[PDB]
């Protein structure tokens, strides 16, 4: 069985990284032909020696954007919105602004014209300040020309998706998306009954950190989930057809690529690579420059189905937490790495690659 070699492989990938980045706790979940394998390391909380388990809740940060994309997928396949809709079509308070000339697709894929990585400090979690921010916003770049990774960009995408469905974003996620995907350990707001499972996050000098409120936090970076639940989400992405048709279609909608930057094809939330690919190249696709700097896009003649021999991934970080997810449809392989430190993306990719590559090499013919 390929499973027989997993424990040694995962320990080897994980433990050196945990040591070098002083990571208090880390959970791995791997799906091999739909069968889950869990590896838990260290402490969810140092103050009270609570061990990480597959049910420990971590902040997954921007991995939340794949859930947001799924809600948007559902809106799209229910004909509540279309990707070439003007943004202001779904929020009348934006009519007259730059959002008259920006598409939903632009927002979704960070190409609206240089919406920043995060809202300025001064924008509070308040409909009217958010509205006013977008009403006064002026672009850096022409739309559809430059990718600049952006919470306010895809955050507005998610918010407008919710508006097209006629319900608050948080309500749709909690009452329709999470249940559709069979996720009972996944939260935007961790309830009373589950607080005991919420890991502590650790920042510089081991400052304890859990994510605070912010504008469009639910849409951009607000999910808390367990390694076991996030692997259920990954398995739903590997086999959407196992869901009821509306939700199967919603997931398929997130697996469509619109443009390339270097080796990376941008989907809705998901970012995709050809598989196999080299470690160095996967790291560069997930680099600090990819996250922080503008990049010229190579637009595709037509949206590409992100299927077959490809790797789809998303990193996610908060002040206290560092997550990574990946799946490879042509290997029926899913992977989740959740940690309670924000440690470098390159190290997350190192772990994931050791695992993916290790499994790849058992499937060779001897001599
Ligand atoms: B991801 O994770 O990538 C992101 C982006 C942007 C922003 C954010 C926020 C965070 C906190 O605050 O935590 C995220």
Author numbering: 3 to 369
Anything the authors wrote about it?
According to their amino acid sequences, β-lactamases are classified into class A, C, and D enzymes, which utilize serine for β-lactam hydrolysis (SBLs), and class B metalloenzymes (MBLs), which require divalent zinc ions for substrate hydrolysis. AmpC β-lactamases are clinically relevant cephalosporinases. They mediate resistance to cephalothin, cefazolin, cefoxitin, most penicillins, and to β-lactamase inhibitor (BLI)-β-lactam combinations. In many bacteria, AmpC enzymes are inducible and can be over-expressed by mutation thus extending resistance to broad-spectrum cephalosporins i.e. cefotaxime, ceftazidime, and ceftriaxone.
Inhibitor 3 is covalently bound through the boron atom to the side chain oxygen atom (Oγ) of Ser64, adopting a tetrahedral geometry as already reported for other similar complexes. The catalytic and conserved residues in AmpC β-lactamase catalytic domain undergo minimal rearrangements upon binding. The boronic acid oxygen atom O13 forms strong hydrogen bonds with the −OH group of the side chain Tyr150 and with a water molecule W567, commonly highly conserved in AmpC binary complexes with aryl boronic acid inhibitors. The meta carboxyvinyl lateral chain of the ligand molecule is placed near Tyr221 and is stabilized by the π⋅⋅⋅H−C interaction. In class C SBLs, the carboxylate group does not interact in the typical carboxylate site of antibiotics as in class A SBLs, but, on the contrary, is oriented in the opposite direction, towards Asn152, Gln120, and Leu119, where usually the R1 chain of antibiotics binds. The major structural change involves the region near the phenyl ring of compound 3 and comprises a conformational shift of the side chain residues Gln120 and Asn152. Comparing to the structure of native PaAmpC, in the crystal structure of PaAmpC: 3 the side chain of Gln120 is rotated by 50 degrees and the side chain of the Asn152 accommodates a flipped orientation and show a shift of 36 degrees. In contrast, in the PaAmpC:3 complex the inhibitor points its meta carboxyvinyl group towards the opposite direction, extensively interacting with the aqueous solvent. Compounds 3 and 5 do not experience improvement in affinity compared to lead phenylboronic acid 1, thus reflecting the lack of strong additional specific interactions for meta derivatives in AmpC binding site.
